[PDB]
Every structure is written in C-alpha cells, then in structure tokens.
Amino acid sequence: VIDAFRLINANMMVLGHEPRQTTSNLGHLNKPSIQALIHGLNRHYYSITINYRKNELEQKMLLNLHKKSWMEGLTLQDYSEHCKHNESVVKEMLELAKNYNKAVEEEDKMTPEQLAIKNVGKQDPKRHLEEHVDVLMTSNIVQCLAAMLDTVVFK
Amino acid sequence: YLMEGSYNKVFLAKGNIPAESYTFFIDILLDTIRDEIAGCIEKAYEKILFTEATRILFFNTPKKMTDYAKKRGWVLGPNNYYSFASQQQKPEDTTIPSTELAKQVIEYARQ
C-alpha cells in the first residue's frame, strides 16, 4: 500500500488542476478509499505505480531468496526420525479412518447446507487426508530418491 | 512325456512304431535330449561319475568321453564331472533399471 500525493489543493472553487485530458491518471486507477475521502481533502490526486522499467539485471540477481547450498540440496536429513515420523502419522491416519467411517455411516438426508452448519465441531473427516499422505510421500519419495542419487557414482 | 521329468521310457515307447520309421523325428528327439540334459546339468551340481552321464542317458560309451568336451568342457579329474559354482552375487546397484521404479510417484501421478 503506497500513495504519493501531488498537493491536494483548494485554492479556487471553480477549477481543479491544469491537465484534465486523459483517463489513465483519472479513471484507469482505482477510486480512492472512503476514509481517505473523509479525512483527506476531497480534491484527491496521484497515481503510484512501480514504473521502474523492470530492471532485468537486479531482477535476475535477486530472484530466489530461499536457494540453499548445492551440497545441501543432496542432503538426506536422517532415517530415524523419518521412521518415527511415519509411525506418528500412521496413528493419526487410523483415527481419521475412524472419523471417516462414522461420517460415511451417518449419511443423513439433512442436505449438505445443513451438514455445513454442524461441521463447526471437532468433526474433520477427509479434512486432513492429503495434508499427511503427500507429506508422507514427500517424506518417503525424496528419501527414496536421494537414497539412489548418491550410489552409483559414490563407489 | 517331455513335460514330465521322465526322459527315458520314450525310447522304449519308440521301440514300437505304428508307422514306417518315426526315426527321422527321433533323431531330432535325440538332439533335444542331448541339449536338455546338458542345460539341466550345467547349473550347480556335485560331480556325477562318468558312467551316469555316459551310459544311463544314451551312447554306450562310443564317443561320450569326447562328446563331454564337445558340448561344454568341465575338465575331468579323478573320475568326476564337477559343475562350477555360478551363483550371481545379486549386485546391489539397482540405479539404472529402478530409477523410474524409484520415480514411481511423479512420472505417473501428476502433482
């Protein structure tokens, strides 16, 4: 959120500003917020836009702010917490299975609109699923893939 | 009979022939017995004696002492026909043939 006002002015009551010939600085932009109309002088102006020609050199220089070391990219984390993390997730999948069984078991004709007014409680059937299993897969598969991306060349 | 692991009463069943000779095919039968007994003994085994590989199958010792070198080799020592070990180590590389097997999530499930 930026603004850069251009001397919001009220000298004369029958003129605005000198140039009024385009709708780019007059209609193309968003109309100002209501409170800025209230406590600001209503003769508002200005059109803040980044307009720095998109300098490609610094753009390519910055780019990723979360790149890591290349030699960090081949890391394996560790195998022990991988396995106990899997064990931890299996019990929550069991409990999600129990909840899912109950929610398919109810199968009420109360209409899904009225199903969505009583879902505010703890009931979360299929409301997790993905959030662990792909987290499972992205735990496993990379741990699988990095298991084999360091073998045939390291002896 | 070639699907059963009996391989010698065929020739006495060849002893009675309801046709003219049934020998022109029996020559190819002999051939096939030769290379099947070869390929069955060529795996790991523990050195049968000359006489079992010589007379019990076929060839009442004409040239079987020479046919032994003709087919495979397995040089003779003190009257035994030993089979070399030939057990594969199960090389634990599995990178080339199972990297797509390693990738059996991404290149079938589009995510």
Side-chain angles (χ1 to χ4, degrees), chain A residues 2-4 6-19 21-24 26-45 47 49-53 55-69 71-112 114-128 130-155, chain B residues 1-25 27-46 48-55 57 60-71 73-100 102 104-105 107-110:
Chain A
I2 308 95
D3 191 11
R6 188 61 199 193
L7 185 38
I8 315 300
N9 199 6
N11 290 123
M12 187 66 204
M13 295 299 102
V14 290
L15 282 73
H17 65 316
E18 295 180 350
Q21 64 293 30
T22 175
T23 183
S24 74
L26 198 147
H28 272 62
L29 72 173
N30 189 359
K31 292 327 191 175
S33 79
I34 190 167
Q35 76 282 355
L37 183 63
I38 297 169
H39 36 74
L41 305 181
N42 52 73
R43 282 82 52 207
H44 286 287
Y45 286 119
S47 80
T49 300
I50 175 65
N51 272 124
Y52 83 111
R53 274 71 61 193
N55 188 16
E56 192 62 39
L57 188 153
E58 52 90 23
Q59 163 62 247
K60 286 289 186 183
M61 183 278 288
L62 194 140
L63 281 178
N64 44 3
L65 74 164
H66 297 316
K67 50 182 168 295
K68 267 75 61 181
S69 175
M71 291 55 68
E72 198 267 356
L74 61 83
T75 52
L76 193 143
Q77 46 99 29
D78 194 284
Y79 263 117
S80 168
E81 69 275 16
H82 180 79
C83 85
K84 64 181 181 292
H85 192 275
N86 289 128
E87 299 284 6
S88 308
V89 175
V90 183
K91 269 83 76 178
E92 83 178 1
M93 294 183 286
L94 188 145
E95 182 65 26
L96 182 76
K98 298 293 183 182
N99 189 16
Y100 198 62
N101 189 22
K102 305 315 154 295
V104 176
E105 196 270 340
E106 56 93 24
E107 191 275 331
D108 202 7
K109 275 75 66 180
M110 187 66 204
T111 299
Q114 283 76 10
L115 294 178
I117 74 178
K118 57 170 76 55
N119 56 4
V120 297
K122 188 268 183 182
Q123 46 271 20
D124 52 358
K126 81 173 77 173
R127 296 294 86 193
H128 297 259
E130 303 173 354
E131 71 93 25
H132 37 269
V133 287
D134 59 26
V135 168
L136 285 176
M137 293 183 286
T138 55
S139 77
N140 297 324
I141 72 184
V142 183
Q143 185 53 251
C144 188
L145 180 71
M148 280 174 54
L149 287 197
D150 47 3
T151 47
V152 71
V153 310
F154 298 158
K155 198 64 62 160
Chain B
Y1 179 80
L2 269 74
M3 295 298 102
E4 289 82 3
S6 176
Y7 271 113
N8 265 307
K9 92 206 189 76
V10 60
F11 317 111
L12 59 92
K14 182 265 290 180
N16 47 354
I17 290 310
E20 69 276 16
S21 84
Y22 279 171
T23 304
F24 55 90
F25 296 153
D27 291 331
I28 304 169
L29 294 174
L30 300 159
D31 184 1
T32 49
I33 297 299
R34 287 300 95 196
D35 63 358
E36 75 88 18
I37 192 77
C40 83
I41 194 66
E42 279 305 314
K43 51 182 172 283
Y45 214 82
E46 68 275 16
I48 54 171
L49 201 133
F50 170 80
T51 184
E52 295 91 347
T54 301
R55 58 97 188 163
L57 317 167
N60 53 5
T61 319
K63 299 288 94 176
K64 186 59 65 67
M65 73 292 291
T66 67
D67 186 28
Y68 186 55
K70 292 305 177 298
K71 182 68 176 177
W74 282 4
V75 298
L76 179 61
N79 204 2
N80 276 312
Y81 274 7
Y82 59 81
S83 176
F84 63 93
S86 77
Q87 292 83 18
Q88 60 86 30
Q89 206 263 325
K90 181 67 174 66
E92 196 202 356
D93 62 358
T94 60
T95 50
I96 312 297
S98 178
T99 180
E100 299 89 6
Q104 184 178 1
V105 297
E107 51 94 19
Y108 321 120
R110 166 277 291 271

